[PDB]
Structures are given as structure tokens and as C-alpha cells.
Design an enzyme around this catalytic site. Structure first.
Site, mmCIF file in Angstrom:
data_model
loop_
_atom_site.group_PDB
_atom_site.id
_atom_site.type_symbol
_atom_site.label_atom_id
_atom_site.label_comp_id
_atom_site.label_asym_id
_atom_site.label_seq_id
_atom_site.Cartn_x
_atom_site.Cartn_y
_atom_site.Cartn_z
ATOM 1 C CE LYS A 171 6.860 -12.491 0.696
ATOM 2 N NZ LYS A 171 6.757 -12.032 -0.697
ATOM 3 C CG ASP A 178 2.993 -13.767 0.787
ATOM 4 O OD1 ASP A 178 3.669 -14.639 0.177
ATOM 5 O OD2 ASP A 178 3.136 -12.563 0.654
ATOM 6 C CB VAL A 211 6.685 3.991 2.454
ATOM 7 C CG1 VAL A 211 5.733 5.181 2.565
ATOM 8 C CG2 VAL A 211 7.799 4.154 3.476
ATOM 9 C CB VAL A 212 6.687 -0.054 6.527
ATOM 10 C CG1 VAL A 212 6.402 -0.270 7.995
ATOM 11 C CG2 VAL A 212 5.772 -0.924 5.686
ATOM 12 C CG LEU A 218 8.821 -7.404 16.196
ATOM 13 C CD1 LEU A 218 7.376 -7.044 15.958
ATOM 14 C CD2 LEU A 218 8.993 -8.906 16.198
ATOM 15 C CE1 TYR A 238 -3.075 -2.914 2.017
ATOM 16 C CE2 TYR A 238 -1.101 -3.171 3.336
ATOM 17 C CZ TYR A 238 -2.342 -3.633 2.940
ATOM 18 O OH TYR A 238 -2.833 -4.793 3.462
ATOM 19 C CE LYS A 274 1.898 -3.226 6.588
ATOM 20 N NZ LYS A 274 1.489 -4.565 6.168
HETATM 21 O O1 LIG Z 1 10.910 -5.018 9.492
HETATM 22 C C1 LIG Z 1 10.307 -3.782 9.825
HETATM 23 C C2 LIG Z 1 9.885 -3.797 11.269
HETATM 24 N N1 LIG Z 1 8.444 -3.951 11.427
HETATM 25 C C3 LIG Z 1 7.509 -3.942 10.462
HETATM 26 C C4 LIG Z 1 6.294 -4.101 11.063
HETATM 27 BR BR1 LIG Z 1 4.635 -4.179 10.162
HETATM 28 C C5 LIG Z 1 6.562 -4.213 12.436
HETATM 29 N N2 LIG Z 1 7.871 -4.113 12.650
#
Ligand SMILES: OCCn1cc(Br)cn1
Ligand SMILES: OCCn1cc(Br)cn1
Ligand SMILES: OCCn1cc(Br)cn1
Ligand SMILES: OCCn1cc(Br)cn1
Ligand SMILES: OCCn1cc(Br)cn1
Ligand SMILES: OCCn1cc(Br)cn1
Ligand SMILES: OCCn1cc(Br)cn1
Lengths: 262, 300
Positions: free
Chosen positions: B133, B131, B21-22, B87, B19, B37
């Protein structure tokens, strides 16, 4: 039967039972609704049945949408001019949730005969999402029915379709059916279908699974049995028309039993 | 949800999703590091994306230590922000950083056990992930691993009905999907974890195919080409072809040489051809592979 998820079916059932109580509409929200009635809701639901038939939508989608509408109308006062916009957005959300190929937004606008704009529908979409706090994974009558169907000795299509049809009929009439949970209407629908077609009755095995007996199901059963008898006369006929189709084994043509002996 | 974007301070980009960028962000009042997100609803002429509706609705009821927590949804009329527990890393990056050393067997065992817990919980709540992976498995500094990215997840009914065919990243995709079956179930998530388990040991994908047909062929060359005996109904399946080459089943000790007898047993049951015989996440938690399991922290 990994398709029947043997290691998780009981966990799932238990979970749905919990969720159906948390996603229940307010029995009697219509008395608290100044400008709409059960009659108008029946018209809306019947319309949604025809929309789902036309866009070849799943039965699940119809049931989800009705759930969203009832939950919405439980906290949100709506003018009769706007009841269809609620419905349209409900069906859109349901479709996006449940369908491999949801109809596009434009198609939803089109089925409302330009009563509403694309902008209005997408804005009610947001509003419904806000009101339900995205709580969209709701247990339906079908989700219960499909599990109950697994208890047939053996599977009978006529039973399966007839129970689907009866459960659908209940979506139409907020009075009385808002007062029964999906799991209970599905049990009533199943027993009524089973008795009608094969003469048999609610299985011990479903007593084991659900805790329900004919004793506990009796009130809903008496209501559902009435709805079945009077269904040729009901002002809304979309579900009966729908269930004449061969896809559903023409079950709306089967004769309701005159008595239940219950 | 108590959330409002003013209480967050952006820190850095941490990736892209389906959707947009994070970003890693910090709650300025509580101290909590989160991942935001963002969904640009503006570019969405079809309203709120189906992917987002499913991810939010499904993660709202999946509270489990090994499933990433959706903390909040901030629903502005212009944008939709999903606030997630943060995380530090995903399992793919960690495998790349753990090369030449290899992941210690205790840590593999911890990670697999936790993944099975999260997935069992998903399955127990009528949810397929679809999904699994390494990219979508997140690890923290405390040795937790958590299922993430529910954008392709789906709430199922019992029995299952036909769902989407374009499902699961190819390398992790189960034969029943590759052969175009009308029905797929919880077994497809186990298959993925199966591939992931091998992958944690070897540090490389077990079946890296480029096309559907190449994916099948690689699977068949490793596990043998299935017949009616090992998998009843296979020869009937829509995309089964009798012209398929018939490779012999190779001795499973040769598929993952470093793996002990218990590991081999477990993996073999995760990669069983027949979805009906494939081990469930729930049953697998009792597998003797896990007898001595602990939860150590990532070693890097
Ligand atoms: O790898 C990025 C860290 N992270 C992404 C989400 Br959704 C939660 N933590
Ligand atoms: O505006 C007429 C009232 N009405 C709306 C529906 Br939907 C059904 N009845
Ligand atoms: O009478 C035309 C408008 N209308 C739509 C419904 Br649903 C009910 N009324
Ligand atoms: O009255 C809407 C239909 N419905 C109620 C429950 Br709980 C789930 N679906
Ligand atoms: O309408 C947004 C409310 N909400 C919070 C969570 Br978590 C999911 N939805
Ligand atoms: O309007 C900017 C608000 N905001 C975006 C992030 Br990422 C954190 N805060
Ligand atoms: O997957 C079941 C185990 N198996 C596969 C072949 Br070919 C022979 N045995």
C-alpha cells in the site's frame, strides 16, 4: 498454476540451490563436539518429530529446526544437558518463522518436562538468532521435493508421501546424511519413492531442471535405500509411527524394494 | 553487524510500526542518515516477535535498488534495533502533497516500473510482501521508490500451501483472499500494485471498503461480478454466495478516465479476477506502457 508460480519457479529453484550451499552445516561437527554424539542428535530429532505431530506442526517446520540445530552445533560446543534446550529454541524459531499459529513459548517449556525455564528457552532463542545471524530462510528437503512432485505424470499421493517420509528419515542420521545437500536427498527420496510405488525412475524433466542424474544421485540413493530397509530396526521410530497415519497414506507400511537395479 | 547505538544520534520520530516507533538517526562517524526501527523485546513475554524474525531474515537476502535496505540489526538483550536505509517520504504523503496538481504521468510510470522491479525480485526470491500500500512504499529525493515494511511478508514454497488469511490492508486486498480461498500466491501482490497504480493516477483509493463484504461489492461494481467464465471455480469458493448481486463489467475507460490505452491495458491485467491470468511483475516490465519510461525526481 499461479499457485505453482510458473513465471518464477526456475528463478526460485536456482536461488534455493545457491542458498542450500550457504546454509550447509559442517559435515563432521560431531567429531569436534566433545560431549554429544550422532546417537544423541538422533534422539533429539526423533523427539522433535513427536513434538511437531503433537502440536500439529508443518513438516517444513521440523526441517527448518533441524537445519538451525545443525548450523548451531557447527560453531557452538554444547553439553549433553543443554542439547535439548538448543533443540527447543530451534523448534520455537522454526515455528515462529513457518507456522500460521506457532505454539506459545510456555508450550515449548512444557514439552521439555520443566527441564528448562521459560527464561532459559527465550535466552537460547536469542543466542541461536545471534549464531545464525537471523539467517533463517533456509532451503529444506521439502522445498525441493514439492517442486519435483510437479514432474509426476500423473500425481500419485503414495509417491508424494513416501518421498516426504524418506526425506524425514534422513534428518535423523547425521552420518551419513550431513554430507548430502537437501536438493540431493530430495532427488534420492523422490526417485526411491517413485520406483517403490510405480516402478518408474528419475524423470528426464528433472534431469533438465536439476542437472542431477541417477549417476550423480547414486551414492545418496544407496545410503537412503539402506536407511529404508533398516528403518523397522532403527532405534528411533517416531517417523515410522507418524507415517502410518492416514494423513500420509500409511506409506511407512509399504515394503522397501529389495534391489534398485542402479 | 558493525553497529552500536553510540555511533547514532537520534534526530526525530518519523512514524510508528508494528513493534514501536521509527526514528530518523545520523551515523556520527560516516554521516549516514538511517531509520531506526526499535522492537521493545521487554514487552515481549513470547520472545522475539514472529513479525521481526520474518522481516529480518527476509530483508537480509533481498538486496535490490527498489527494496529498502536493512543495514544492520543491533541485538541488545533488552532491545532490538533494525537499522534501515533512510528515505525522505512515503508515497501516501507525496500523493497528498501532489493533489490539485496530480502526479505527472512520467513519474507514475517511473514509480510503477520500479515497484514492478522490486516485486519481481521478491517473487524471484520466494517472498510474498502481502501488505503493498502507498504508506509502505518509500521515495527519495532522487526519484527512487522502494518497497518497505516486510513485517507481514512470508517465504513461500512451490506450489504454495495455505498461509495466513488475515492478509493485506483491506483496500488493497485481492478477491481470492476476500473469498476465503485455501491458496493465494504472488498474484495478491500484483492486485495491490494494480490498486496503487489506479491510486497514483486518481489520487484516491480505487476500492475503499469498510468491511470484507463491502470491499467485494465495490470491486464487483467496478469490474463486474465474476462468474465461472471469467474466473473458473469462483462459484465454488468458500465465501462465495450465489445470492451475490450480479453487477455488469464496466468499460475500463470509465474506471480510470485519464489513463491512456496502454495504461488501461496494463491495469486491466493487474486486476484480472482469475489469479492464474493476472499479469506477473516479471511480464509486466515488458508492457508497452513502459516503452518511453525514464526516472525523473519527485517534483515537490
Ligand atoms: O518514512 C520514514 C523514512 N524511512 C523509514 C524507513 Br524503515 C526508511 N526510511
Ligand atoms: O542428556 C542426555 C543426552 N541426550 C540429550 C538428548 Br536431546 C539426547 N541425548
Ligand atoms: O532422558 C530424558 C531426557 N532426555 C530428553 C531427550 Br531429547 C533425551 N533425553
Ligand atoms: O542438516 C540440517 C538440514 N538441512 C541442511 C540444509 Br543445507 C538444509 N537443511
Ligand atoms: O544477529 C545480528 C546480525 N545481523 C545483521 C543483519 Br543485516 C541481520 N542480522
Ligand atoms: O541509548 C540510546 C541510543 N540511541 C537511540 C537512538 Br534512536 C539513537 N541512539
Ligand atoms: O477480470 C477478467 C476480466 N473480466 C471480468 C469480468 Br466480470 C469480465 N471480464
Amino acid at each position: 498454476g499461479v499457485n505453482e508460480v510458473p513465471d518464477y519457479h526456475e528463478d526460485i529453484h536456482t536461488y534455493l540451490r545457491e542458498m542450500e550451499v550457504k546454509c550447509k552445516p559442517k559435515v563432521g561437527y560431531m567429531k569436534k563436539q566433545p560431549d554429544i554424539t550422532n546417537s544423541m542428535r538422533a534422539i533429539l530429532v526423533d523427539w522433535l518429530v513427536e513434538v511437531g505431530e503433537e502440536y500439529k506442526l508443518q513438516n517444513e517446520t521440523l526441517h527448518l529446526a533441524v537445519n538451525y540445530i545443525d548450523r548451531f552445533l557447527s560453531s557452538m560446543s554444547v553439553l549433553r544437558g543443554k542439547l535439548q534446550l538448543v533443540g527447543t529454541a530451534a523448534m520455537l524459531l522454526a515455528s515462529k518463522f513457518e507456522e500460521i499459529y506457532p505454539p506459545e513459548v510456555a508450550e515449548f517449556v512444557y514439552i521439555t518436562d520443566d527441564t528448562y525455564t521459560k527464561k532459559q528457552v527465550l535466552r537460547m532463542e536469542h543466542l541461536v538468532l545471534k549464531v545464525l545471524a537471523f539467517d533463517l530462510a533456509a532451503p529444506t528437503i521439502n522445498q525441493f521435493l514439492t517442486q519435483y512432485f510437479l514432474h509426476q505424470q500423473p500425481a500419485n499421493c503414495k509417491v508424494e508421501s513416501l518421498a516426504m517420509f524418506l526425506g524425514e528419515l534422513s534428518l535423523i542420521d547425521a552420518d551419513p546424511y550431513l554430507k548430502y545437500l537437501p536438493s540431493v536427498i530430495a532427488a534420492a527420496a523422490f526417485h526411491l519413492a517413485l520406483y517403490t510405488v510405480t516402478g518408474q525412475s528419475w524423470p528426464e524433466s528433472l534431469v533438465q531442471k536439476t542437472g542431477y542424474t541417477l549417476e550423480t544421485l547414486k551414492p545418496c540413493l544407496l545410503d537412503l535405500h539402506q536407511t529404508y530397509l533398516r528403518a523397522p530396526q532403527h532405534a528411533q521410530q517416531s517417523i515410522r509411527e507418524k507415517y502410518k497415519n492416514s494423513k500420509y497414506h500409511g506409506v511407512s507400511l509399504l515394503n522397501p524394494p529389495e534391489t534398485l537395479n542402479v | 553487524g558493525p553497529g552500536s547505538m553510540e555511533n547514532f544520534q537520534k534526530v526525530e520520530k518519523i512514524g510508528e510500526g508494528t513493534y514501536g516507533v521509527v526514528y530518523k538517526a545520523r551515523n556520527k562517524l560516516t554521516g549516514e542518515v538511517v531509520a531506526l526501527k526499535k522492537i521493545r523485546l521487554d514487552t515481549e513475554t513470547e520472545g522475539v516477535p514472529s513479525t521481526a524474525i520474518r522481516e529480518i531474515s527476509l530483508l537480509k537476502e533481498l538486496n535490490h535498488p527498489n527494496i529498502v535496505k536493512l543495514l544492520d540489526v543491533i541485538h541488545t538483550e533488552n532491545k532490538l534495533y533494525l537499522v534501515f536505509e533512510f528515505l525522505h517520504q512515503d508515497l501516501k504523503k507525496f500523493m497528498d502533497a501532489s493533489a490539485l496538481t496530480g502526479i505527472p504521468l512520467p513519474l507514475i510510470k517511473s514509480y510503477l516500473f520500479q515497484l514492478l522491479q522490486g516485486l519481481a525480485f521478491c517473487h524471484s526470491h520466494r517472498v510474498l510482501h502481502r501488505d503493498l500500500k502507498p504508506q509502505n512504499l518509500l521515495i527519495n529525493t532522487e526519484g527512487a521508490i522502494k518497497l518497505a515494511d516486510f513485517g507481514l511478508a512470508r517465504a513461500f514454497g512451490v506450489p504454495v500451501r495455505t498461509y495466513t488469511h488475515e492478509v493485506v490492508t483491506l483496500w488493497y486486498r485481492a478477491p481470492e483472499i476476500l473469498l476465503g480461498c485455501k491458496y493465494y500466491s504472488t498474484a495478491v501482490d500484483i492486485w495491490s500494485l494494480g490498486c496503487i497504480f489506479a491510486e497514483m493516477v486518481t489520487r484516491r483509493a480505487l476500492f475503499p471498503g469498510d468491511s470484507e463484504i463491502d470491499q467485494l461489492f465495490r470491486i464487483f461494481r467496478t469490474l463486474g461480478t465474476p462468474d465461472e467464465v471469467v474466473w473458473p471455480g469462483v462459484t465454488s469458493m468458500p465465501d462465495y454466495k450465489p445470492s451475490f448481486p450480479k453487477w455488469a463489467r464496466q468499460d475500463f475507460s470509465k474506471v480510470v478516465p485519464p489513463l491512456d490505452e496502454d495504461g488501461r491495458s496494463l491495469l486491466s491485467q493487474m486486476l484480472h479476477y482469475d489469479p492464474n491470468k493476472r499479469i506477473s511483475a516479471k511480464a509486466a516490465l515488458a508492457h508497452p506502457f513502459f516503452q518511453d519510461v525514464t526516472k525523473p525526481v519527485p517534483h515537490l
